[PDB]
Amino acid sequence: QKPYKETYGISHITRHDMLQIPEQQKNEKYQVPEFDSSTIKNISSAKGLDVWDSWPLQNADGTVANYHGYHIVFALAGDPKNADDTSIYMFYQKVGETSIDSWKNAGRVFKDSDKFDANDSILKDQTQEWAGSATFTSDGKIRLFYTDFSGKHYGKQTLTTAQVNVSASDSSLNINGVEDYKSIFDGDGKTYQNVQQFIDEGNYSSGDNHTLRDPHYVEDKGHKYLVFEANTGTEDGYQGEESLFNKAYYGKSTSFFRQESQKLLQSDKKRTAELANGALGMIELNDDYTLKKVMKPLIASNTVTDEIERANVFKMNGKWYLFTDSRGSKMTIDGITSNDIYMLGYVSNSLTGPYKPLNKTGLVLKMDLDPNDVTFTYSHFAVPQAKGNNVVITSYMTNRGFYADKQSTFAPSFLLNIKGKKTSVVKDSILEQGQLTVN
Ligand SMILES: [Ca+2]
């Protein structure tokens, strides 16, 4: 077929941009820090469990929250030897502490008995509790969103939520039970990808990747949304051979494309490309947290890579930032090796409109450390603060399943300066093994 530049009304991750990221990502303003291991210890509260991808119960706008003189958190958490055992436990601390050991673990959020009591068709096939957000409601409640996926229906990722009825005490914090347990979204097909269309390619064999996870809860003018990791559906320009001919996914200029589109496909990977069709997405909710509108995705990684992960977004010092973590490993951009790993940033004047990379590449943070390294760190998450130009970068250290007395723990959070549309790792800011703040 011939050339077309169509941007579908939304922004995208041009490849051009993604092509400076091999030169620019060598500047240290943009580089996660070498951490010290003689420091890193594991989690008391957890108990030999591995613990990665985590979120903090936060407020309306971004900031961590005070649910009763208490800092709270939400991690994936598994039996190290089980690559299919995922579950959302709930660690939590006091609100004046920093120390890793300040983190009592409150137990698996959910009862095995739960998926059923729920009354959610899609929910009784759930076989793994993946990641999301956790707001904290104006009427003092705990509202959780997370990934409802199942390895039985081909890895269908679904949009799930629940309130976390729970009681607090001057010293501890237990979990009575949960309610308002329902699944919101499973993909709509024209705009995002539902597990049916991933099966039409054969499913996994096909080679293509299906993701619908990490709903970030936020709100602007009292409208409260969910922004996630996804894949372009079938109208918001979609994965295909066709795919590679739209100049919207190259950017820079025509004639640029003509080289790249050419290279390319003359690739060793025309394909890993045609199928890479990912996105950070949007949808609206009702105060009962039911889907209200499916909205246009906020961005697409069209051709670069089919799996943007751990999506974020929030207003800070007046403008809207938005993010994501992703594995260079799984992208098609020369000079971005399989050791590469990232968090990316886009900004806009308005939550829903139009996100131009930060740093001019939307590169904000790169990380390479060999996988065996004890200081590997994945999922870096940009936590907003009351004010200041810094936000706190969280992550989980050390890989799930590698060492045998070393376990998916919290790697030291740290700092990051952001102002305007430029960021910069703040030099020498390593805070505590999990600090969610600074105050
Ligand atoms: Ca895909």
Swiss-Prot record:
Catalysed reaction equations from the record: [6)-beta-D-fructofuranosyl-(2->](n) alpha-D-glucopyranoside + sucrose = [6)-beta-D-fructofuranosyl-(2->](n+1) alpha-D-glucopyranoside + D-glucose
Give the binding site residues for sucrose: W52, D53, A131, R213, D214, E307, R327
What induces or represses expression of this protein, per its UniProt record? Answer: Induced by sucrose. Expression is controlled by the sacR non-coding regulatory region, located upstream from sacB.
Q: Identify the GO cellular component terms for this protein.
A: extracellular region
Is Glycosyltransferase included in the keywords of this UniProt record? yes
Location in the cell reads: Secreted
Annotated EC: 2.4.1.10
The site feature described as Transition state stabilizer is recorded at: D214
pH-dependence annotation = Optimum pH is 6.
Q: Where are the transmembrane segments?
A: none
Instruction: Summarize the impact of N209A.
Output: 14.6-fold decrease in catalytic efficiency. 2.2-fold increase in KM for sucrose. Levans are barely formed
Q: Which residues form the active site?
A: D53 (nucleophile), E309 (proton donor/acceptor)
Its primary localisation, in coarse terms, equals secreted
What modulates its activity?
Ca(2+) may play an important structural role and promote stability of levansucrase. The enzyme concentration is a factor defining the molecular weight (MW) levan distribution. A bimodal distribution is reported at the usual enzyme concentrations. At low concentrations, the enzyme synthesizes high MW levan, and at high concentrations, it synthesizes low MW levan.
Effect recorded for Y396N: Drastic decrease in catalytic efficiency. Reduces affinity for sucrose. Synthesizes only oligosaccharides
Which annotated residues bind Ca(2+)? Answer: D208, Q239, L275, N277, D306
InterPro entries reported in the protein's UniProt record: Glyco_hydro_68 (IPR003469), Glyco_hydro_beta-prop_sf (IPR023296)
Q: Which Pfam families is this protein grouped with? A: Glyco_hydro_68 (PF02435)
The terms under GO molecular function for this entry are: levansucrase activity; metal ion binding
Biological process (GO) annotations?
carbohydrate utilization
User: Impact of changing G328F on the protein?
Assistant: Drastic decrease in catalytic efficiency. Reduces affinity for sucrose. Synthesizes mainly oligosaccharides, but can still catalyze the synthesis of low amounts of levan
Q: Can you state the subunit structure given in the record? A: Monomer.
Q: Name the job this protein performs.
A: Catalyzes the synthesis of levan, a fructose polymer, by transferring the fructosyl moiety from sucrose to a growing acceptor molecule. Also displays sucrose hydrolase activity. At low sucrose concentrations, functions as an hydrolase with water as acceptor, whereas at higher substrate concentrations it adds fructosyl units to a growing levan chain.
Q: Which family does it belong to?
A: Belongs to the glycosyl hydrolase 68 family.
From the Swiss-Prot or TrEMBL record, give the protein name: Levansucrase
> What does the record give as the organism's lineage?
Bacteria, Bacillati, Bacillota, Bacilli, Bacillales
